[PDB]
Amino acid sequence: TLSILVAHDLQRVIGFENQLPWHLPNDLKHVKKLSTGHTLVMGRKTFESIGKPLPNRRNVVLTSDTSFNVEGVDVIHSIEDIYQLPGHVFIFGGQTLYEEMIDKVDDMYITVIEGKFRGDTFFPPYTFEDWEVASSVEGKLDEKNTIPHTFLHLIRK
Numbered sequence: 362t363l364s365i366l367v368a369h370d371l372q373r374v375i376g377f378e379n380q381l382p383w384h385l386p387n388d389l390k391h392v393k394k395l396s397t398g399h400t401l402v403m404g405r406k407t408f409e410s411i412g413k414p415l416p417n418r419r420n421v422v423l424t425s426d427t428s429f430n431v432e433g434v435d436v437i438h439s440i441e442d443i444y445q446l447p448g449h450v451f452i453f454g455g456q457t458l459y460e461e462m463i464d465k466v467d468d469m470y471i472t473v474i475e476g477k478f479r480g481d482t483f484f485p486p487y488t489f490e491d492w493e494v495a496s497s498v499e500g501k502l503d504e505k506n507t508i509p510h511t512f513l514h515l516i517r518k
């Protein structure tokens with residue numbers, strides 16, 4: 362499969378200043394569960410945000426810098442290179458990946474962060490007319506996960 366994996370807020374904010382706008386450990390645990398043993402493709406800037414490869418899956422960074430060679434990352438330099446990767450590939454961020462990728466992906470794992478944050482980066486507007494809810498499961502709140510949130514899984518209709 363080829364999937365978006367993204368958390369966005371009530372106005373589709375994903376990012377602020379090259380970071381997530383929220384602290385929400387449940388969602389990062391969700392990312393882990395979903396992606397472990399599989400492949401991430403991210404934009405260069407998102408890679409700079411996580412700063413190192415994530416363990417126990419394959420990490421692929423899309424970048425135009427051909428001098429890019431990082432330990433345990435695989436570089437690619439075009440959108441097209443994605444479509445040849447073996448297996449279940451998650452588009453992992455960021456704003457520009459999502460824009461390039463959203464009409465190409467089979468499905469999307471979105472966490473809707475039921476808040477309104479300040480962002481400088483956004484997820485593309487989409488329409489549920491295009492997208493079928495295979496599941497919708499509320500996140501559980503606790504002291505350390507204090508923002509309401511819903512795990513959507515959308516298949517393209």
Ligand SMILES: NC(=O)C1=CN([C@@H]2O[C@H](COP(=O)(O)OP(=O)(O)OC[C@H]3O[C@@H](n4cnc5c(N)ncnc54)[C@H](OP(=O)(O)O)[C@@H]3O)[C@@H](O)[C@H]2O)C=CC1
Pocket residue numbers: 366367368369374375376377378379380381403404405406407408410423424425426438439440453454455456457458459461481482
């Ligand atoms: N909420 C969420 O689920 C997530 C949010 N984010 C957020 O997203 C924001 C980052 O978004 P954005 O600024 O768009 O950054 P991106 O992470 O999408 O990276 C952009 C970079 O990726 C490379 N790139 C993208 N497309 C291509 C292409 N087609 N060919 C060659 N290179 C390409 C370029 O690298 P180069 O300049 O080296 O050529 C470009 O500068 C941050 O705010 C971050 O916090 C990130 C992940 C998840």
Ligand SMILES: COc1cc(Cc2cnc(N)nc2N)c2c(c1OC)O[C@H](C1CC1)C=C2
Pocket residue numbers: 366367368369379380381388389392407410411415452453454472
């Ligand atoms: C933009 O920054 C991040 C993006 C992301 C990507 C990301 C986060 N949340 C969601 N829902 N989708 C995503 N694609 C993550 C993230 C980020 O900050 C560290 O943290 C952890 C990694 C191990 C450290 C997980 C994710």
